[PDB]
Every structure is written in C-alpha cells, then in structure tokens.
C-alpha cells in the first residue's frame, strides 16, 4: 500500500476515527483526511503522528 491506505489502516486497526487520532497526535483531523486521500506527503507532523501511531517514519513512508 501507500501512505494513505496505511495511515487509515493502522487508524481503523487502532478503532480510532480522524480526529481522534488527529487530537492524540496533536494535529486536526483535516490532516488526516488529506494524508489519506495521499495529499500531505510529509507534513511536518510526520515523526509526532509516527510515534503517537506506534510505528516509525519509514513505516509510515514506506510500510515495513
């Protein structure tokens, strides 16, 4: 998979929605809704939503 795809994966797999991920993290859900849909590549939030999701940066960049 993409990006995308792993980030509303981990998050349903978690049984989070958008913004409550988004909250946990810190950011809004809006960029949630964008990395899905593939739009944010890296955001600046990228390690702090990694660490808050449990995976590294390359999990989120490439998917290990």
Same mark, same amino acid.
């Given at each position: 998979?993409?990006?995308? &795809?792993?980030?509303?994966?981990?998050?349903?797999?978690?049984?989070?929605?958008?913004?409550? !991920? %988004?909250?946990?993290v +810190? =950011?809004?859900?809006?960029?949630? &809704?964008?990395?899905?849909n593939?739009?944010?590549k890296?955001?600046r939030?990228?390690?702090e !939503? %990694?660490?808050?999701? +449990? =995976?590294?940066?390359?999990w989120?960049?490439?998917g290990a």
């Amino acid at each position: 998979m993409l990006m995308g &795809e792993r980030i509303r994966a981990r998050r349903i797999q978690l049984g989070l929605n958008q913004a409550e !991920l %988004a909250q946990k993290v +810190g =950011v809004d859900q809006q960029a949630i &809704e964008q990395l899905e849909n593939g739009k944010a590549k890296r955001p600046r939030f990228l390690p702090e !939503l %990694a660490r808050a999701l +449990g =995976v590294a940066v390359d999990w989120l960049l490439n998917g290990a």
